Each structure stands twice: as C-alpha cells, then as structure tokens.
Amino acid sequence: WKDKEFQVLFVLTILTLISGTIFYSTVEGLRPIDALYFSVVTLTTVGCDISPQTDFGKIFTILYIFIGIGLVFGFIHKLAVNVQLPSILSNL
Template identity: 55%
Template sequence: MFFFHTIFSFLKNREYRDLLYTTMIILIIGTVSYHYIEGWGIIDSLYFSVVTLTTIGFGDFSPQTDLGKIFTIIYIILGIGIILQFINTVQNHYSETRNKRHKKH
C-alpha cells in the first residue's frame, strides 16, 4: 500500500510528471529510432534504449550500422542525464515519503 501511495503522490506533483513525460519521450525516441535504423523489433529496441541509458549495458545488443552507432553516441550524451535524474528523483521522493511516514508513527 505504501508503494502505491508513493507513486500517486509522485504523480500529483507537476515537476515530477514533467520529468516522467520527458523520460518517456526519450525512451520512445530511442525505441522508434533503433527500430528503423537497426531493424530491431519494438521490444528489443525499447530494451536496448533502457539498458543503454541506465548504463547497465549487458552487451547482448549493439548497433551494427554506422548510423546506429552515431545515433547511440548522441542518444547517450543527451539521454543519460535525463534518465539518471528521473531515477534519482524517484528515489529521493520515495525516501522523503518514507521518512515522513516514520515521523508520524
């Protein structure tokens, strides 16, 4: 229940929602681009976008075309900061909500 409360309170905040929308747009751009540039399926393209921008980099997919490699360089430079900011914001929000809840009890 606490998890859902945290998510709903996160979504109520306009700045958090804007960051979520920006993150989704970045992932959609990567997914669509890899789908057309590399010819990957939508799921594989989304998977690669997430794995790349979260800096996990499993190595099971990699761009094979020159255009795909150039796009990846630009995509990482532009997207990694946004994705990491989103992850950091979610973690901070969760921690703040948990601390407020513990103070009440």
C-alpha cells in the same frame, strides 16, 4: 506525482525512450521490446550484450547518450524520493 518537476522529468524520459524505441526498431531491426530494452540499458548505463550494427546506429547511440543520460538520472533520482518517502514517513 503532482509535482510538476517530477511530471516534466517523467514526460521527457518517456519521450526520449519512445524516440529510441522507434530508432532501434526501424534502423537496427530490433523487435520493439528489444529496442526499448536497448534504449533503457543504454541511458541508465547498465549496458547489455549487443551494440548497433550500422554506422548510423552508432552515431545515433553516441548522441543519444549525451542527450539523454542526464535527464534519465534526474528522473531516477526524483523517482527514488517518491518511492522511499512513504516508508520514511512511516518509520519516523
């Protein structure tokens, strides 16, 4: 968690999710929790059962995916290392 590389990826991920939450809650009229949910399932590629209704929201979502998918998967990978390492080091 002290690893600056992990810390920066965390910050970038949080900032990207905040931006999506603000966007979808104000332009697409979603409750904050639903805007955050939509942002997360979009950038992790899980998807969900809704899509943006406005043209602005569709264009934003296209750009958001290309801006954010690589960072989010970089963060998920670094997070996975941190989470599994204590179990690996106990199982040695």
